Design an enzyme around this catalytic site. Structure first.
Site, PDB file in Angstrom:
ATOM      1  N   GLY A  26      69.627 -78.450  66.715  1.00 39.54           N
ATOM      2  CA  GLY A  26      68.291 -79.044  66.895  1.00 39.54           C
ATOM      3  C   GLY A  26      68.365 -80.559  66.931  1.00 39.54           C
ATOM      4  O   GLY A  26      69.364 -81.099  67.449  1.00 39.54           O
ATOM      5  N   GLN A  28      68.782 -82.858  64.554  1.00 43.23           N
ATOM      6  CA  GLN A  28      69.908 -83.413  63.752  1.00 43.23           C
ATOM      7  C   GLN A  28      71.236 -82.795  64.218  1.00 43.23           C
ATOM      8  O   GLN A  28      72.182 -83.561  64.462  1.00 43.23           O
ATOM      9  CB  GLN A  28      69.672 -83.174  62.260  1.00 43.23           C
ATOM     10  CG  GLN A  28      68.531 -84.000  61.672  1.00 43.23           C
ATOM     11  CD  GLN A  28      68.810 -85.486  61.628  1.00 43.23           C
ATOM     12  OE1 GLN A  28      69.941 -85.924  61.399  1.00 43.23           O
ATOM     13  NE2 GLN A  28      67.775 -86.277  61.853  1.00 43.23           N
ATOM     14  N   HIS A 107      68.526 -82.721  53.620  1.00 39.02           N
ATOM     15  CA  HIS A 107      67.218 -82.824  52.922  1.00 39.02           C
ATOM     16  C   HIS A 107      67.326 -82.044  51.606  1.00 39.02           C
ATOM     17  O   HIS A 107      67.953 -80.964  51.610  1.00 39.02           O
ATOM     18  CB  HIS A 107      66.098 -82.325  53.852  1.00 39.02           C
ATOM     19  CG  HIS A 107      64.711 -82.448  53.308  1.00 39.02           C
ATOM     20  ND1 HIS A 107      64.272 -83.567  52.624  1.00 39.02           N
ATOM     21  CD2 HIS A 107      63.648 -81.617  53.396  1.00 39.02           C
ATOM     22  CE1 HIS A 107      63.006 -83.407  52.291  1.00 39.02           C
ATOM     23  NE2 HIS A 107      62.598 -82.217  52.756  1.00 39.02           N
ATOM     24  N   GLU A 225      45.870-101.599  73.017  1.00 40.66           N
ATOM     25  CA  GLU A 225      45.928-102.583  71.904  1.00 40.66           C
ATOM     26  C   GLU A 225      46.410-101.892  70.623  1.00 40.66           C
ATOM     27  O   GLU A 225      47.267-102.475  69.930  1.00 40.66           O
ATOM     28  CB  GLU A 225      44.573-103.263  71.673  1.00 40.66           C
ATOM     29  CG  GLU A 225      44.190-104.257  72.754  1.00 40.66           C
ATOM     30  CD  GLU A 225      45.342-105.008  73.405  1.00 40.66           C
ATOM     31  OE1 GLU A 225      45.858-105.953  72.781  1.00 40.66           O
ATOM     32  OE2 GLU A 225      45.715-104.653  74.545  1.00 40.66           O
TER      33      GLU A 225
HETATM   34  N1  LIG Z   1      63.874 -84.041  61.887  1.00 46.56           N
HETATM   35  C1  LIG Z   1      64.778 -84.983  61.661  1.00 46.56           C
HETATM   36  O1  LIG Z   1      65.018 -85.869  62.485  1.00 46.56           O
HETATM   37  C2  LIG Z   1      65.513 -84.957  60.376  1.00 46.56           C
HETATM   38  C3  LIG Z   1      65.842 -83.737  59.848  1.00 46.56           C
HETATM   39  N2  LIG Z   1      66.312 -83.605  58.570  1.00 46.56           N
HETATM   40  C4  LIG Z   1      66.753 -82.278  58.047  1.00 46.56           C
HETATM   41  O2  LIG Z   1      67.747 -81.761  58.895  1.00 46.56           O
HETATM   42  C5  LIG Z   1      67.610 -80.322  59.011  1.00 46.56           C
HETATM   43  C6  LIG Z   1      67.440 -79.970  60.467  1.00 46.56           C
HETATM   44  O3  LIG Z   1      66.102 -80.345  60.879  1.00 46.56           O
HETATM   45  P1  LIG Z   1      65.757 -80.482  62.437  1.00 46.56           P
HETATM   46  O4  LIG Z   1      66.986 -80.854  63.194  1.00 46.56           O
HETATM   47  O5  LIG Z   1      64.541 -81.329  62.589  1.00 46.56           O
HETATM   48  O6  LIG Z   1      65.375 -78.969  62.789  1.00 46.56           O
HETATM   49  P2  LIG Z   1      64.998 -78.236  64.161  1.00 46.56           P
HETATM   50  O7  LIG Z   1      63.561 -77.845  64.108  1.00 46.56           O
HETATM   51  O8  LIG Z   1      65.470 -79.075  65.298  1.00 46.56           O
HETATM   52  O9  LIG Z   1      65.908 -76.925  64.055  1.00 46.56           O
HETATM   53  C7  LIG Z   1      66.335 -76.277  65.275  1.00 46.56           C
HETATM   54  C8  LIG Z   1      67.606 -75.512  65.002  1.00 46.56           C
HETATM   55  O10 LIG Z   1      67.387 -74.615  63.884  1.00 46.56           O
HETATM   56  C9  LIG Z   1      67.825 -73.321  64.220  1.00 46.56           C
HETATM   57  N3  LIG Z   1      67.010 -72.358  63.489  1.00 46.56           N
HETATM   58  C10 LIG Z   1      65.648 -72.385  63.335  1.00 46.56           C
HETATM   59  N4  LIG Z   1      65.187 -71.393  62.616  1.00 46.56           N
HETATM   60  C11 LIG Z   1      66.316 -70.668  62.268  1.00 46.56           C
HETATM   61  C12 LIG Z   1      66.491 -69.497  61.506  1.00 46.56           C
HETATM   62  N5  LIG Z   1      65.493 -68.831  60.933  1.00 46.56           N
HETATM   63  N6  LIG Z   1      67.754 -69.038  61.351  1.00 46.56           N
HETATM   64  C13 LIG Z   1      68.755 -69.713  61.927  1.00 46.56           C
HETATM   65  N7  LIG Z   1      68.711 -70.818  62.663  1.00 46.56           N
HETATM   66  C14 LIG Z   1      67.448 -71.254  62.799  1.00 46.56           C
HETATM   67  C15 LIG Z   1      67.700 -73.227  65.735  1.00 46.56           C
HETATM   68  O11 LIG Z   1      68.544 -72.231  66.267  1.00 46.56           O
HETATM   69  C16 LIG Z   1      68.126 -74.637  66.150  1.00 46.56           C
HETATM   70  O12 LIG Z   1      69.538 -74.750  66.271  1.00 46.56           O
HETATM   71  C17 LIG Z   1      66.436 -79.940  58.099  1.00 46.56           C
HETATM   72  O13 LIG Z   1      66.879 -79.536  56.810  1.00 46.56           O
HETATM   73  C18 LIG Z   1      65.639 -81.239  58.057  1.00 46.56           C
HETATM   74  O14 LIG Z   1      64.824 -81.339  56.900  1.00 46.56           O
HETATM   75  C19 LIG Z   1      66.369 -84.717  57.764  1.00 46.56           C
HETATM   76  C20 LIG Z   1      66.429 -85.921  58.282  1.00 46.56           C
HETATM   77  C21 LIG Z   1      65.918 -86.182  59.635  1.00 46.56           C
HETATM   78 MG   LIG Z   2      47.206-110.103  71.958  1.00 42.94          MG
HETATM   79 MG   LIG Z   3      62.006 -84.542  56.312  1.00 42.42          MG
END
Ligand SMILES: NC(=O)C1=CN([C@@H]2O[C@H](COP(=O)(O)OP(=O)(O)OC[C@H]3O[C@@H](n4cnc5c(N)ncnc54)[C@H](O)[C@@H]3O)[C@@H](O)[C@H]2O)C=CC1
Ligand SMILES: [Mg+2]
Ligand SMILES: [Mg+2]
Ligand SMILES: NC(=O)C1=CN([C@@H]2O[C@H](COP(=O)(O)OP(=O)(O)OC[C@H]3O[C@@H](n4cnc5c(N)ncnc54)[C@H](O)[C@@H]3O)[C@@H](O)[C@H]2O)C=CC1
Ligand SMILES: CC(C)CC/C(O)=C(/O)C(=O)O
Ligand SMILES: CC(C)CC/C(O)=C(/O)C(=O)O
Ligand SMILES: [Mg+2]
Ligand SMILES: [Mg+2]
Ligand code: NA
Lengths: 340, 341
Positions: A26, A28, A107, A225
Site C-alpha cells: 500500500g 507505506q 504505528h 486564496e
Molecule cells: N498512511 C501512511 O502514509 C502511513 C502509514 N502508517 C502505518 O503503516 C501501515 C500501513 O498503512 P498504509 O500503507 O496507509 O495502508 P494501506 O491502506 O495502503 O494498506 C494497503 C495494503 O494492505 C493490505 N491489506 C489490507 N487489508 C488487509 C487484510 N485484511 N489482510 C491482509 N492484507 C491486507 C493490502 O493488500 C495492501 O497491500 C499501517 O499500520 C499504518 O498505520 C504510518 C505512517 C504513515
Molecule cells: Mg496575496
Molecule cells: Mg497514522
C-alpha cells in the site's frame, strides 16, 4: 534527553545476507519495498489476492501470500491496515516467523491493543515514519528522507536496534532523523494529528471559503486564496523549514505582516483547545479504538459513504471547477516506484 | 462566467521593443525582474538607496532612482509596500510617466484608498499574483506558474489588456491561469487571507503543540506532527492539486481516514465563523486601512516588536530545537534569481 539517529549513527551491515519481507504493498509498503531494493537490500512482498499483489508483480518484486513471505525472511515489515494486524499476526506471521527474526510495525496501535505481541526467540519493534508514501519515495530519490520514531519493544537477539536503524537508513529516514519514542506515545500523537489537527485545518480553510461565498465573493477566487492557489500549502511546508511566524516575516509584504500580527494569537476561542483535549481523552480511553473496530468490520463501508459525501461538499465542488480552469504545477509520477 | 487567460490567450508581441521599469526589488520586484529578464523583455530597476538597490546591481540589473527608471520606461510595475505608493506615485511616477505608458499594481489597496489614480494619456491596471516571490521564481524555471488576478482600471491607449496579459505571460502566471477580478474585491479577499486564514492556521498548529506539551508529550515530537515534519504542509500543498478530503482518501491509512472523518466538519465552534465575518467588516469598512496607516507612520516599529516577540513563543523555541536536531529537505535557493533561459 532525546536520542536521534542520522546517517553517521547507522549502517546497512546488519542487512548483509538477510531478506526483508514487506507485508502489504500500500502507501507505506510500496515505498519501503522500492527504497529497500534501490539501497541493495534483498526484498520480498507478501500480499493477499487483491490489486496491490498485481501492482507489486508489475513493479518487478517477488510476490507471494503473507505466510510464505514471512517463512523466507529475516526481517518482516507489517505494512497493512492496523485493525487487520491481529488476524494476520495470529494466522500468518507468528506461526512462520524464524528464530532471531525481527517484526516491525509502522504505528503503535496494534501493540497498545495487544493484537501484535512479543514471541519467544524473536525481536519486535516500531519504525513509524512522520510522512506518507510518495514524499518518502521522492525524498529518497533526491538523496533526502523524512523523519521517523522507533521503539525496541522486545529484543531476544540483542541485535534488534542495529537492524531497525539499518532498515531506517535503507529507506532514508536517518537522512532527516530517527528519534526514540515509546509505541504508546506515538499511537496517541499520530491519532491526535489525524483526528484533531488535520480535520481542524481543513474545517478552517472551509470556513474561510464558506464566509467569503456567503458575503458575495467570487467562489473560484475564494477557493484559490484559502488553499487552491497552493499559497497556504507553501506557507505551511516552508514553515516546516524556517518556522511559520518566520515565513510571514521573510515573504509577506508589510501590509500582510501588519494584518497577520493584528490577529496572530487571537483567532481561536478556548473551545478549540478543549475539543483537542476531548479528542485526546477518546484516543487514550479506548473510545476511538472501539469506534475504529466497528467502522472496520464491514470492509469500511461507513468510510466509503463518508469519502463519497465529502466530494459533494461546496468546497470540493468549487475545487473541481478551479482545477478544470487553472493548471497546478505537478511532477510526473510514472515509474516513480520502478527500480532506480 | 469567469474570464481566465492561459498561455494560448496571451503573447509577448506587445513587449517587442518596450522597456519595463520594476519599481522595488523586494519579494515581488526581484521575482518579476528575473522572470522578465529570462523571457527576453528589456527590464530596469528603480529603487531608493537601501540594500535592495545593491542586490539588484549584484544580480546584474540596470538600477537607478525611481524617477529615472519611470522616465525611461513604457511599462512601470509599482512593487513597493502599499503605504509607500501614495508619496512615490505623486513625486516619482506621475511626473515621469510617458504618454501611452502602463502603470501596474500587484494589490488593489492603493487604488481603493485613492493613492494611485488614473492619469490622462496613460493606462492603469492591477496584476495581483496569488503567491510570494520564491515559488513564483521556482515555478517559472520549471516551466510552470502561479495564478494571478488582473483588472484594467483605465485604458487610454486601448492596448492596456494586451500589455498587462503580456507581462503575465513573461512572468509565468498564464501557465496556471490569470482571472479578471475587480481591484476592490482583490483588496478585501487578499487582506482576509492575511488577517483571518493565515493567523487561524498557525494559531491552530500552535493549539495542537500546546495541548500535547501541557499533557506531557515529547515537545520535539509534538512540534514535528503539528507541522515540523512537513506532513501537514505536504497535505495542504498536495490538497491544492487534488483536493484536501481527496489527499486523505488517497494517502491516509484506513485508521487515519476513520479518525479524520469522525471529526471533519465538527472541530470549530460558530465563534470562528463570526470572527471571519468580524475581520471582513474591519477590512471592508476601512478600520484595517486606518490601523495599517497608524502602523506605517511609526516606520513599522510595532511590526518589528511583534516579529521579535513571536520568536520567543514556545512554538518557535521548540522549532529551533527541532531544526538543530532533524535535517529538513530543501532545494538550494542560492542560485534561484541567477540568469536562466
Ligand atoms: N498512511 C501512511 O502514509 C502511513 C502509514 N502508517 C502505518 O503503516 C501501515 C500501513 O498503512 P498504509 O500503507 O496507509 O495502508 P494501506 O491502506 O495502503 O494498506 C494497503 C495494503 O494492505 C493490505 N491489506 C489490507 N487489508 C488487509 C487484510 N485484511 N489482510 C491482509 N492484507 C491486507 C493490502 O493488500 C495492501 O497491500 C499501517 O499500520 C499504518 O498505520 C504510518 C505512517 C504513515
Ligand atoms: Mg496575496
Ligand atoms: Mg497514522
Ligand atoms: N509579499 C508578497 O509576496 C506579495 C506582495 N504583493 C504586493 O506587491 C507589492 C510589493 O510588496 P513586497 O514585494 O512584498 O514588499 P517588500 O517589503 O519586499 O518591498 C521591498 C522593496 O520596496 C522598496 N521600498 C520600501 N519602502 C519604500 C519607500 N518608502 N519608497 C520607495 N521604495 C520603497 C525597497 O527599496 C525594496 O525595493 C505590494 O503592493 C504588495 O501588496 C502581492 C502579491 C504577493
Ligand atoms: C507570505 C504569504 C502568506 C502572503 C503573500 C501574499 O500573497 C501577499 O498578498 C502579501 O504579502 O502582501
Ligand atoms: C495522509 C496524512 C494526513 C497522514 C499519513 C500518516 O502519517 C499516518 O499515520 C496514516 O495514514 O495512518
Ligand atoms: Mg502519521
Ligand atoms: Mg497581500
Ligand atoms: Na522572524
Amino acid at each position: 534527553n532525546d536520542l536521534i539517529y542520522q546517517d553517521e549513527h547507522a549502517s546497512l551491515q546488519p542487512l548483509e545476507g538477510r531478506t526483508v519481507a514487506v507485508i502489504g504493498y500500500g502507501i507505506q509498503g510500496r515505498a519501503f519495498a522500492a527504497n529497500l531494493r534501490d539501497s541493495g537490500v534483498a526484498v520480498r512482498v507478501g500480499n493477499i489476492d487483491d490489486r496491490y499483489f498485481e501492482l507489486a508483480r508489475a513493479e518487478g518484486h517477488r510476490v507471494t501470500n503473507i505466510a510464505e513471505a514471512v517463512a523466507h525472511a529475516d526481517i518482516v515489515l507489517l505494512l497493512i491496515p492496523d485493525e487487520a494486524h491481529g488476524a494476520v499476526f495470529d494466522v500468518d506471521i507468528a506461526p512462520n516467523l524464524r528464530d532471531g527474526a525481527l517484526l516491525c510495525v509502522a504505528h503503535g496501535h496494534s501493540l497498545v491493543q495487544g493484537d501484535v505481541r512479543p514471541l519467544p526467540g524473536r525481536d519486535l519493534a516500531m519504525l513509524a515514519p512522520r510522512m506518507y508514501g510518495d514524499p518518502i519515495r521522492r525524498y529518497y530519490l533526491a538523496g533526502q528522507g523524512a523523519p521517523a520514531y522507533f521503539d525496541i519493544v522486545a529484543d531476544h537477539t540483542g541485535r534488534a536496534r542495529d537492524r531497525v536503524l539499518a532498515i531506517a537508513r535503507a529507506v532514508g529516514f536517518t537522512r532527516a532523523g530517527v528519534m526514540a519514542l515509546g509505541y504508546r506515545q506515538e499511537t496517541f500523537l499520530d491519532l491526535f494529528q489525524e483526528q484533531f489537527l488535520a480535520p481542524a485545518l481543513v474545517d478552517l480553510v472551509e470556513t474561510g471559503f464558506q464566509v467569503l461565498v456567503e458575503r458575495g465573493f467570487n467562489p473560484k477566487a475564494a477557493l484559490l486564496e484559502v488553499y487552491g492557489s497552493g499559497e497556504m500549502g507553501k506557507m505551511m511546508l516552508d514553515g516546516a523549514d524556517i518556522g511559520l511566524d518566520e515565513v510571514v516575516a521573510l515573504q509577506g509584504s508589510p501590509t500582510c505582516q501588519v494584518g497577520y500580527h493584528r490577529w496572530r494569537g487571537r483567532t481561536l476561542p478556548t473551545a478549540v483547545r478543549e475539543l483537542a483535549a476531548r479528542v485526546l481523552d477518546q484516543i487514550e480511553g479506548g473510545d476511538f479504538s472501539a469506534y475504529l473496530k466497528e467502522q472496520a468490520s464491514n470492509d469500511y463501508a461507513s468510510l466509503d459513504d463518508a469519502r463519497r459525501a465529502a466530494l459533494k461538499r461546496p468546497l470540493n465542488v468549487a475545487h473541481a471547477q478551479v482545477r478544470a480552469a487553472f493548471r497546478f504545477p505537478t511532477e510526473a509520477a510514472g515509474g516513480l516506484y520502478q527500480a532506480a
